[PDB]
Design an enzyme around this catalytic site. Sequence first.
Site, PDB file in Angstrom:
ATOM      1  N   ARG A 124      -0.494  -5.764  11.129  1.00  0.00           N
ATOM      2  CA  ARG A 124       1.016  -4.997  10.320  1.00  0.00           C
ATOM      3  C   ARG A 124       1.097  -3.977  12.037  1.00  0.00           C
ATOM      4  NH1 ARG A 124      -2.227  -4.526   7.060  1.00  0.00           N
ATOM      5  NH2 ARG A 124      -1.953  -4.623   4.482  1.00  0.00           N
TER       6      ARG A 124
ATOM      7  N   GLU B 256       0.584  -0.910   0.033  1.00  0.00           N
ATOM      8  CA  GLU B 256       0.014  -0.196  -0.046  1.00  0.00           C
ATOM      9  C   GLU B 256       0.710   0.906  -0.774  1.00  0.00           C
ATOM     10  OE1 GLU B 256      -2.532   3.244   0.676  1.00  0.00           O
ATOM     11  OE2 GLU B 256      -1.050   2.555   1.728  1.00  0.00           O
TER      12      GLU B 256
ATOM     13  N   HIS C  61      -7.900   2.116  11.817  1.00  0.00           N
ATOM     14  CA  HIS C  61      -7.866   3.129  12.377  1.00  0.00           C
ATOM     15  C   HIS C  61      -9.640   3.606  12.496  1.00  0.00           C
ATOM     16  CE1 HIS C  61      -4.061   4.065  10.655  1.00  0.00           C
ATOM     17  NE2 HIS C  61      -4.405   3.351   9.817  1.00  0.00           N
TER      18      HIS C  61
ATOM     19  N   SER D 281       2.840   0.522  10.535  1.00  0.00           N
ATOM     20  CA  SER D 281       4.284   0.658   9.415  1.00  0.00           C
ATOM     21  C   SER D 281       5.269   2.249   9.608  1.00  0.00           C
ATOM     22  CB  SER D 281       3.510   1.092   7.734  1.00  0.00           C
ATOM     23  OG  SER D 281       3.075  -0.094   7.753  1.00  0.00           O
TER      24      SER D 281
ATOM     25  N   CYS E 279      -5.712   4.382   5.776  1.00  0.00           N
ATOM     26  CA  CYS E 279      -5.959   2.804   4.917  1.00  0.00           C
ATOM     27  C   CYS E 279      -7.098   2.628   4.752  1.00  0.00           C
ATOM     28  CB  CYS E 279      -4.641   2.576   5.288  1.00  0.00           C
ATOM     29  SG  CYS E 279      -3.967   1.362   4.686  1.00  0.00           S
TER      30      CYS E 279
ATOM     31  N   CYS F 258       2.999  -0.355   5.185  1.00  0.00           N
ATOM     32  CA  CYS F 258       1.397   1.130   4.147  1.00  0.00           C
ATOM     33  C   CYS F 258       1.990   1.930   4.357  1.00  0.00           C
ATOM     34  CB  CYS F 258       0.706  -0.074   5.507  1.00  0.00           C
ATOM     35  SG  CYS F 258      -1.493   1.014   4.871  1.00  0.00           S
TER      36      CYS F 258
ATOM     37  N   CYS G 156      -0.653   4.385   5.872  1.00  0.00           N
ATOM     38  CA  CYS G 156      -1.154   4.076   7.394  1.00  0.00           C
ATOM     39  C   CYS G 156       0.121   4.768   7.575  1.00  0.00           C
ATOM     40  CB  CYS G 156      -0.535   2.675   7.390  1.00  0.00           C
ATOM     41  SG  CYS G 156      -1.853   1.853   7.737  1.00  0.00           S
TER      42      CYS G 156
ATOM     43  N   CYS H  18      -5.764  -1.640   5.770  1.00  0.00           N
ATOM     44  CA  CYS H  18      -6.289  -2.248   6.797  1.00  0.00           C
ATOM     45  C   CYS H  18      -7.268  -1.329   6.714  1.00  0.00           C
ATOM     46  CB  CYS H  18      -4.704  -2.072   7.907  1.00  0.00           C
ATOM     47  SG  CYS H  18      -4.383  -0.089   7.769  1.00  0.00           S
TER      48      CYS H  18
END
Lengths: 267, 534
Positions: free
Chosen positions: B461, B16, B70, B484, B63, B528, B531, B66
């Site tokens: 992640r 991503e 969030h 990330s 994102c 990501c 992210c 994922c």
Amino acid sequence: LMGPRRPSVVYLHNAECTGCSESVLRAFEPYIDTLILDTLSLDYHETIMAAAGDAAEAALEQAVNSPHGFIAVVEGGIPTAANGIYGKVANHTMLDICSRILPKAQAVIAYGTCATFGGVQAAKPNPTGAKGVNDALKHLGVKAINIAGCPPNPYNLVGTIVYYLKNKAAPELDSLNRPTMFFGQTVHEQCPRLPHFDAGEFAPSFESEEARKGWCLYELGCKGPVTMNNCPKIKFNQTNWPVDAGHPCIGCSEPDFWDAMTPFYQN
Amino acid sequence: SSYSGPIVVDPVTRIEGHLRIEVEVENGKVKNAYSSSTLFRGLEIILKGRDPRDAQHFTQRTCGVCTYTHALASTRCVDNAVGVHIPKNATYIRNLVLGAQYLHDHIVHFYHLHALDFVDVTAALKADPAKAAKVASSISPRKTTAADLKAVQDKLKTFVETGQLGPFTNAYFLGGHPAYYLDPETNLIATAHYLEALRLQVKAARAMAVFGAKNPHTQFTVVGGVTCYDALTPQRIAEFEALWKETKAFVDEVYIPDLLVVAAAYKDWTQYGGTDNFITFGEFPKDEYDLNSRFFKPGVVFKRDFKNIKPFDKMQIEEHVRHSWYEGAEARHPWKGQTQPKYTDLHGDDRYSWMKAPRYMGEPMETGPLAQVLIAYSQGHPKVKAVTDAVLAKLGVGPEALFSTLGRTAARGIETAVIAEYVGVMLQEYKDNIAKGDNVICAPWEMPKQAEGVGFVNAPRGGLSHWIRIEDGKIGNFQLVVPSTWTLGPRCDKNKLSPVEASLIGTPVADAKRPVEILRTVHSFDPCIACGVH
Ligand code: SF4
Ligand code: SF4
Ligand code: F3S
Ligand SMILES: [Mg+2]
């Protein structure tokens, strides 16, 4: 990437969250494998393509300059502040990338509210000067078909592409350049809770018995009355949509919705 | 033929977001590395002054890979700030959607993002499908026949012969590549399953929409709980269960056996991309206010000392900006965070990324599946230990093998298998709770004028945290510190290489024009960038 045979698609990622690309992966009848093997030639897509680096850049050039022509699908807003530097790919600004590529496309589809209208990074105070594709590239004559939502229903992307391939033209578009076949009705006029709205039967809180009973979510902020999308009809993932999950519509297929529809829990 | 000089990979694809990796190579091996994140959006800036209830809707758009994570982190954060204790059923439903997110995410990562680093799709055309079917049937209880695999080969042949290779255009394996090791049959098996996974992931994602409205970007969480009364019904629970069961079968019968057959072929990859330090936040709580109530527990490990797992102290996180495109050089705890962009171009004033550089007690920390698995193992987690030991035994390797690119990749599978089973436990607990007559899914709460809150998610992640300062009932400060960011952020003001940067040192590169070995390590972290930067 492509040659004759299947129509070439160049898919670009600007200022985006990749949620719109993920939505395409949810394609149903046809599924994404049929789309990539049979319907289209997906000739550039940074999320799933094999090539990286210089090899990916060569893949993109090869696609864009093909004498066979290509369709561009664009995800994300274009950051324009500070001469575009807030977003770069291969050390080119996204503004520059899109300015060079999109005028060469046979057709452009702006997929998702970010690409259509600016989206989340364009919400106030918009530090990167993020713009939708047609806004950013007005001066180059780019007029992308806008398939709005955050993310849109992938039914709407496939339906638009199929139409375009069949008819060699865009379908009827609304004044926001969205296809009327998908965006011609408010979410609200299609909503199962509309009889409760008409009766002034509103849930006063999420914990209430009225919410349990499925009463209208307007007092809890539902933007269905001011939002154009096909969510109640098509649903998502063949199974649900926000109001049937008990949560108000947040207006996500409308321009500037982050600022126009907020606070999300008020009307 | 051993290359010395730079290599740049920009874009790094099959992640991503927008990443530029720069390395220096000396005698065919990486000597130095930079992780450069090249898109900024500024969601933390945008949130200032808004209603805290609105934060999860904005931050979910950090994102879409994922997705949900969030929204969950922001809702946990505002829940925490207002002091609401959400009902047991809201915890169950939130946890079940998160479990489903892990399965979807890790299956797509292995097949659709990682595997083209290891699988030569075009060599599958050379395969004997009868031989391939035998191999496939030997590694899985699922039986595969020659005809099954010939159908894949025939479809692929048509595709390749059209000359329109689409996503395989200019692949590093075209023509052959000395770093690609699989035989034609194993390539055919993996390719078949890549294709199958394209349709299976539809079901895996649908499982999230059953309770969560839609995928991508769920719409069922509120401060105080969840909104989905329909999630209490036997019909929606049955729908979820059926999608979960089919997803789990794919994990158990297709993904993990494939992971093991590929790892066995690339056992040299136990020698590259190790890291020193690990951080994890735990996940799947019984008690929203107690991280130690989670099925995976939080912890911190320095210098691979798993005999001395340290408690996680949330006050020991600071995010550096000295090598980032923000003002100044001062690291900040996220409750005192600052997001003040200032671009200087690549290596301008020694700055090269839009990510901040989070440090824990000053150290760079890997987060994600390898941290979650190794820390849980070391905490005596019975399910993690059983699965990890079985994987090690199958591979014929010792536990030291886990500290590597291969190890990391294996740990992603281990966690998927363990979570897939645990979703059934949570589901049963949820059913049991409903059966006791508990039908409550949202709790009332009140907005304080002044408050601080934090929400913790261990996402696919790794350790995700959202931090709010409420002032006059509005967002005074909202800071995201994302997995990330930890793993792929740049150097800090102590010039410590980040986990990805450090892990790249030592990577061999057979062919600098096609540096698949760099991709293997980078992809093992599952980057990501949307992210990491937000
Ligand atoms: S429209 Fe929404 S889902 Fe699509 S890229 Fe933008 S933020 Fe992500
Ligand atoms: S829930 Fe929303 S879309 Fe449905 S009737 Fe009420 S206001 Fe309209
Ligand atoms: S929030 Fe978006 S997905 Fe549909 S229900 Fe409202 S337009
Ligand atoms: Mg941040």
